[PDB]
Each structure stands twice: as structure tokens, then as C-alpha cells.
RNA sequence: AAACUCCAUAUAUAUAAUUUUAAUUAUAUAUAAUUUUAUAUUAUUUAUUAAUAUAAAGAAAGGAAUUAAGACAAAUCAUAAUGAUCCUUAUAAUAUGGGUAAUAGACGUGCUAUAAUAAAAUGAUAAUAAAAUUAUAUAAAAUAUAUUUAAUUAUAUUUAAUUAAUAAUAUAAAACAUUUUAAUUUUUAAUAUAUUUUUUUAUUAUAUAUUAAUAUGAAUUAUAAUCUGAAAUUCGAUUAUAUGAAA
């Protein structure tokens, strides 16, 4: 849990183009902190193999992009 | 020739001996007195809370039946209460031989003139 | 009064028990540079301690808490043999040796 | 003609392997950029500065290449390159330490009690 | 202290039968003599078990009460001793004596 | 210890002729370093070998000597030093309270440069 | 403990000035630690030895 | 038996300890503040309380977030995790550890308690 | 970054230093033990030194010390 | 080593002890705390058509 | 091979201007034991002897290292190194992210616990250690916040001394004393009572449930804050409030 006094984990992202054009933002920065500006924008977040499409809501601010792109498949046994 | 010189009382009538047990060491000053004991400047009951430790210190004086005939000023460092109490015991026995060398055999027979060699052994 | 102000301003660098004021510096790359730096600080501290026109810090008592902490980390053998226990009459008395007495003449 | 790393670096004088080369490159670039990283970290962590300058420094820190990261330096055996159980007193792995120790190569090392 | 030693000397069994796995056939129950250190262990364990049935929260109090009752004649561990001696008297012929 | 003691004895002889009162060599506590290794190269972490290194220490003190003579001692014993012996020298110079002519960090400079760069000045604008 | 805090703060400030120390009475995080840490670059960059060996 | 807000207490129970034991959301520190506010001495027991004092405890307890209200806050925070599709929300739904614990072994308690409608 | 001197010391036999002896065999005597140890090669490695009596030499040394 | 399976041949000739330490108060010393002082042991390996082979020589100087 | 040896232990000498102090120490050298002596008894191959006891002398009671051979063609080509064979725009090299942390069952090894011969608090002229560590550092005291008089614990601020027998990590802990402790009506309270008064006795009230989980236990989980780092989402550590499973 990053200390609040340090601020957000800001990463270089192309937000201006996604706000003037509406294009999805494809990114591997799973550590990135979802800033309040991101709300409404569409992100494609790498999960190690694919890019998961996700739109950001107001209940996602503060969390990190990686939290919404699971990297493992649900476990199953050959019962 | 030999390297042993007769031990004698010092200028103040005190017999000084050193004793060791485990990691503890004790330097005692034995003089003729009335049974007063000081451990590191503190009363015996203050420094040693366990009565068994106090009894160990008294045992050498009990063997020669001279518990009320000497004043002991014991200084000890290292280890814990048991090591220090028995290191003082060993040192008093070694210091009492100067006052009467004829009692060494009785002290040896009681086992107070033998240095205990047991120490913490690194497991092998 | 100036000695008291000097000791108050030194803080942890003064040990009341020993009366020693010790300060070290390795900030610079050359020892000569560091020697001057400590010298300059000493002159500055002495000037402030000797300028009692505004404040003398006489109300402020000397704080020794730093020294107390250091003392607790060391062992203190501050006990001496009681003087009223000494028995000078039990000390061995030098014996008369004619040979040594005769070999000296 | 085609160096594998963005900046030209001199080779270590002894045993060489790909992992040693990668670790050595990171070590050299950490030294070249150590002051830069400390200066940006200062600006980003100094609460007396405005938040905008603090966030700008944090962004610049996130954009530095991985070969400038102190936490990516890993001590490896200078004789074999193995990166597990490396004694820092000799910069050798346990096995190479034992072999060198028994050959009399370590200045004051002898067999224990 | 004299009361404790008298109680330990009266409660401890003099002998105890032990099973020896001698031979492929059934083991033999032969009476064996006990030394004083072994006798005190048997009697002390009986005392502790009897003491731990008392109401006091403090073991010292329960032990004190148990020792007081034993010094006054009343103890349930004397039955154990009689049953160990009965078995030994039965197997007296099983003894080897060489 | 062997070279250490021999070299220490030589220093005492050098000082005597130089007129330097010397004390020692006082033996200081020996430091012991220990390393435990597994004898096998791959597995078998149940058999472990022990290794150790002992640092032997000696202290020689100099008294009532002028600085120039003390430097001659250090120079001579340096010229004729033995293998595997290290030497640390603490010099004590008593001085007057007030002397005549006496006896900025890299990071700070870069911070000022960075805070003047356009990527930072563009924000500091008030 | 009975010494007024104002008096003890005046001593702390003056002492810090004489000894060229940073006086931060409020306690705000200033990053001074970062500015004082030692540079480990030279030691880290020599791990594998001197590269300018005769070959 | 002393009844405060439905909860039953044995007479000998110490008030500050009993309150932090039977009431959800009240711990040791919170229980001590309630007793200090009502003038109950540190080690007062339930049987000593009078009816006016039992009503005062219920009043102070009714102005706090405890029992259903406190439990609802936890159930709603867990539901929000599932609604946003966070990794943690899925763990709660799958009855798996949500705090990084390994699952190759152990993880038995998370299998019994981790759920969106957490008790 | 210090003055350096090199002192080569010549040994006239290869069996006076264990290190030199091992290197010679390993690097120069391969044609003698690559098809098994030649019966002549082994014989040479057994007549290098006369079989000195260690006991009398040891006792001669101890007598000199006593003298 | 291999000089298709590794083979080891051992040649042993002479003394591997020192009697100066038994008949006299002189005491032996262990080099590196595991090697006797009289004994000097060294190993050298090389590569042939088959591969690596080691030459292990041990001399006892008294 | 044993041993000789080195270590430990006991003692002696040397060194330290006894403020780098632990001289009750440090570390170089040497000495000492594989103990010795007599005495009675019991056996013997009875002798110039063993097993015992007894008195006497002594500090004397413990360890180490290494290998001689051979077997498992036992482990390792992943510490590094070699032959053969295979890849050579890829089976080599670099970057970003992910994984190695998945989870039905099973197994090994640990930790914590299931309460009264045992757990929890408190103990400042500070009960009592050893062995280590600090230039790719160890961090004192003080102040601020959590937070309350203070202490305690955690973090921040600041960075004293020491690169070390000097200063720091670091006032060892258990022990011991006092207080408290569910199950337990074995308690607590109200009156009265006492030559048990930190307590006794008497009369009332103090629960019901209950083979059971408490003021035992601390898994699980919510929320907030902190630490390291460029970065803590998968996937780290710490603190506070709340949660309080199995046993
Ligand atoms: K509660
Ligand atoms: K996991
Ligand atoms: K398991
Ligand atoms: K990973
Ligand atoms: K318990
Ligand atoms: K995380
Ligand atoms: Mg400083
Ligand atoms: Mg402290
Ligand atoms: Mg210290
Ligand atoms: Mg690392
Ligand atoms: Mg002293
Ligand atoms: Mg793994
Ligand atoms: Mg507990
Ligand atoms: Mg103390
Ligand atoms: Mg502090
Ligand atoms: Mg204490
Ligand atoms: Mg305690
Ligand atoms: Mg609890
Ligand atoms: Mg249950």
C-alpha cells in the first residue's frame, strides 16, 4: 500500500488522445494508479497474454489497472 | 625448576582467589571477620535471590566450620546467577587454603577445589 | 555564565562526567579541510557562549540524558573493599635472613 | 558492431557469461545515473515543493530505463556467475568459496574448529 | 521432611513384576527388586495423581493437603501398593535366582 | 601472528634509536569471522563445512615526541614493511583554541539544475 | 521537564545554527535524508574487477 | 441475568469486558470509553448496575454503529469489490484467500468464511 | 596502484614442487598414460629418489638439535 | 578420467608421515587447518580426445 | 593408522605508562595427565598380575581435524569445466508484462494454540550474559504524532558518536516480587460481624444455557495510516480500530 503522502503512481499514458478522439488506451502499466481524470475512458490492460478491455467508473479511482485484468485461469480438477 | 610460589596474605590480611564456572568469573577477597558478605557491593540477599545459590557460596565455609570467622568481598561478572554463585564458591575455597593449608585435603574431598569444566557445547 | 551557555549549546557533544567536549567531522574529502571546519565551529560556539548580552540560558539546566543512556550500555564496577574490613596485623612479617643481611656488608 | 546494450561498456576482466554481462552493464549505468536518480527522488519526496513539481519528478523517475535501477543489481559469483548463496566477503558462491578456500586463494581463510 | 520420607518409604512398593520378552513364546512375568530412587518415583507419581484430584487452584496447596493426609494415614495409593505386592507374591516361583 | 609480532618488535627497535618512548605491543582482542558451507555442489545440505578467519591485532603507543620524528618513524617502518601486515596510525596533535588561518554537494547542484529546466519551470510558474 | 518548551526550542535552534544542522521544528518531510545518503556507485561498479587488465 | 439491547449477561461479568464481547463493533478501547462516559468505575460488574444505568448504556449503544449497522458496512464494502470486478472481489466470490495467502495448502478458514454475504 | 616486483625462481627438478610436477605430467606426459601407464613411465616415477630411511634421518635430526 | 569409461590408476611410493614429531617434543602444524605441513598436494587437469583427466600428485618432504 | 597434535581447562613468564579498562581482561610463549601412589579384598595364567574398595596427591572432568580400500556405473552436465550429438533469423541476444505464489485430494518439515506445577500486566540510583555486526554503514539522545500526565509500542523529524577492546545496534530474557485471571455460587455486591481486617462469619441478591470456546485461542476479514523501492495490482513488511474461525 503506497503511502498517501507520496501521491499517486503516475505513469506516462496517452490520455489526451483518448479524451479528444475516444480511442482505447492499450497499456502494460498494471501498476498505474487510476486517477480521477481516467473516469469514463476506455483502457486495454495487458494480463501477460492478452489485453483486457475495461472502462473506468467512479468506483475504480484509487485502484490500479492491474486489479481488473486477472492473469490466471480459474482452477479445475479432473474429477 | 618449578614455577609455584607460596601463596600468602597481602598487606591487609586478605586472601585473593579467582574462580570460574560456565562463562562467569569471580574474584573474592577473604579476610578474618564475623561472617559479613558483599557481592558487587550489594547484600547477598539482594544480588542472589535463590536460596540455593546462597547455600552454594556458604558451603566451603561450612566444610571448615568457619562461616562466622571470615568476611567475604566477592566481585563477579559474566554468565548468570548460577554460574556466578558457583564461581564465587570455587574462589572462596581456593582463598581459604592460605589461612590454613592443612584443610586443603578436606576442601578437595568436599569437591569445592575442583573447577567445573562443563560449558555450553555447540551441537556437533 | 559563559561556560554554562557553552555546555548547553553543545548538547550531546558534552559529557558532564568527564567534562570533555568532542566533535568530529568527515564531511570533506581532505583531513585538512575537516580540521578547519571543526576549528571554525569551535570559534563560532565560543563567540556565542561569550556573548551574554541577549540570553545567557542560566534558567535552562544542563541536560545529561544522552550521557545517562551511554552509561547504561557499559558495565560499572564502582565497588571497593570496605576499609573497616582491612586487617593489617594479619599480613606476613618479613623474616630475618642472616645470609642476605651478611651478603650486604 | 551490434552491442546488445544501449550504451558501450567495457567487459569484466575475468569469467564472462550473458548474465554477468547483463548485471555488469546495470552496475555501470547505476553509477552514471546515481546522482540523477537521487536528485529526482529528492524533488519528489520534498513536501516543501508544490505537488506539481513533485508529480513531475515521479513521472521522470518512472520513465528511466531498467538498467538505472539500484534494486536490479544482483551479486553474482565472479568466478562462475552463479547468483545463489554468494558470500559478499569474497564475491563467490558457496562451492567456489570452498574450492578457493582449500587451495589457499582466500587471504586469511582456514578450516574451522 | 521426616514425614515425607516416612510416607515415601511406606507407599513405595518393594518389588514390581515386569514382563520380559524372553523367547519366541509368551513373555514371563518375573518379580524384580526396586532401588530407593526407583521406589520414590513410583510413590511420588501416586501422590501427584492423588493431589491433582483436590479442589485448590494451586498445586502447592493440593500437594500439601495430599501429603498431610498421607502423613495422617489416609491415602488411596496404599491400595495400589497392595495390588503390586499381590501380583509379585503370585509370581514368586517365576523368579530365577540365577 | 608470526609476522605481526616480528614486525612489531622491529618497530620498537626503530623507535628507540629515534628517541621515541614506545609502549607495547599490546595485544588487542582477536576478531574471528566464520562461514558455514555445504560440502556438496548441488544437494546434501546436511553435511556442512566450517571456515574461519582470525584478525590479529597489536597496539604500539608513542609518547612525548615531536611530529617530525614521529613521521620519520612511520616513513622508515613503511619502507621496510612485512607481507600481510596492515597499519593504522592515529596521530594526536595538541593545539591552541584560536589558530591562524585555520587547521555544494553533487546532489544539491543537480537539483538546482533540474528545478531550472523547462520540464520543471513550466509548473513553478505562479 | 519543567523547563518551558519555548526555552528548549530557542536552545535547539541556536545550537543547530552553530553546528550547521537542519532545524525542522514542524517535522515536515523534507527529503534531507536523500541529500545526505552516500553514493555507492563507485563500489557497486567495481564488483567484477578492474576492466583495464593486460590481456 | 442483565439484558442490554437483547444481549444477556451473567451478573459477575465485568461491564467493560462484557460489552466488548457480546456487541459487534465494540472492542476493548470502545468499551472503556462507554463506561468512562457513564460514570461506571473500571471494574464494575453487571449485577451492580441499576435500571437507570442499564438504560444509559442502551442509549449510548444506540448512538453508535454496532450490530446490524456495523455488519452491513462490511457486507457492502465486500459487495462493492465484486461490483467493480476487482481481483479481490473474485476471491470473495470463489471462497478463496483475499490477502495473498497461498492455496496449495491450508486456506481452510477462507473456504468457510470468505463470501460476499460475510457474517 | 603500488610498486610491483616479480622474482622468478628456477627449480632444476620437476619433483621438487607438487604444482610443477602435476602440470608437467598433465601437459607433457600424456603420450605415456593416454593408453595406460607405460611400464617404463611408472618405473621412472618410482626410481626418482633413493629410498631414504626416514627413521635414521629423523633421529639424526633430533640428535643434532640435542647437541 | 578417460585415457568408454573413466579409469583411475594410482602410483604410491615412499613415506607419508613424519617421525620428527613422535620421538621429540616438536609438534606438527596443519596448513589451512586441514593439510599436514610435511604434505604438499596439488591437482592439474587437461583435455584429451575423450575429455578431462586429472593428475593428482602428493609429495611428502621431511 | 593410532598417535603426535590443535582446541578447551589449570598454572607460569612477557606485553598494557590499568582513560580503547573488561587486569574479574586481552594474546604471545612455555608447562601439565594416556593421572599417580600406597593399602585391604576378590579372582587369576598367583606374578614384577587384574577387578574392586580404601587413604593420599592433583585444577584435571571434554572435544577436534584428517583419511585405507571397495560398493551403490547413488547425486550433480543447474556451482564451473570436457567429449560426442543437436540449434545457428535461433534451441543464441535485448525490452515490457505475466508466471515460478494457481488449488480437488495426498505427503514431509515447522510455527502458534487448546488456562491455574500458567498465562497476562508492572518492576529507573535500571538483577544477571555470550558471541557477533557497523565505508555498498550501525544509528544515540531529543522532539512530534498515534495519545492520554508520563511510560510503553510504532513511525516521522533530526543525524550525536563510532569505521570501532573507545561509539552504535543493545537497560538480554526467562528468573524473582506484586497484581490479575474465564470455566468457578471457589465470584461479586448490600447490610451486620470479628482478636483472620489486602481478611473471617452470617443473611439476602449474584442466570440461563451448557460438552462446553473465555477475559483461552488469533485464523479469517473490513477500513485507515506507515516502511523499502522507480514501481507493492497479480505478489512484500508494520501499526491502529473493528472482526474473533478451528482447536
Ligand atoms: K465485540
Ligand atoms: K497465492
Ligand atoms: K502441508
Ligand atoms: K513475478
Ligand atoms: K495459558
Ligand atoms: K501488493
Ligand atoms: Mg557527525
Ligand atoms: Mg533507549
Ligand atoms: Mg560499547
Ligand atoms: Mg536484490
Ligand atoms: Mg580495570
Ligand atoms: Mg518455488
Ligand atoms: Mg497469549
Ligand atoms: Mg543492569
Ligand atoms: Mg531514541
Ligand atoms: Mg532490567
Ligand atoms: Mg516478564
Ligand atoms: Mg486474548
Ligand atoms: Mg468446537
Author numbering:
A (entry chain S): 9 to 87
B (entry chain I): 140 to 263
C (entry chain Y): 214 to 318
D (entry chain N): 2 to 114
E (entry chain G): 150 to 247
F (entry chain J): 52 to 154, 180 to 202
G (entry chain X): 1 to 55
H (entry chain M): 2 to 120
Published text:
METTL17 is a highly conserved mitochondrial matrix protein that has recently been linked to mitochondrial translation. Using comparative sequence analysis, mutagenesis, biochemistry and cryoelectron microscopy we show that METTL17 binds to the mitoribosomal small subunit during late assembly and harbors a previously unrecognized [Fe4S4]2+ cluster required for its stability. We then grouped particles from the two datasets and resolved the structures of the SSU, SSU-METTL17, and SSU-mtIF3 at an overall resolution of 2.3 Å, 2.6 Å, and 2.8 Å, respectively.
To further clarify the putative role of METTL17, we also formed a preinitiation complex by incubating the METTL17-containing SSU with a recombinant mtIF3 (the second dataset). A cryo-EM density map was then calculated, and we identified a new class containing a subset of 53,922 particles that was processed with a signal subtraction, followed by 3D classification using the mask for the mtIF3 - binding site. Comparison with structural studies of earlier assembly intermediate states 56 suggests that METTL17 can be accommodated on the SSU in the presence of RBFA, and we also show that METTL17 is replaced by the initiation factor mtIF3.
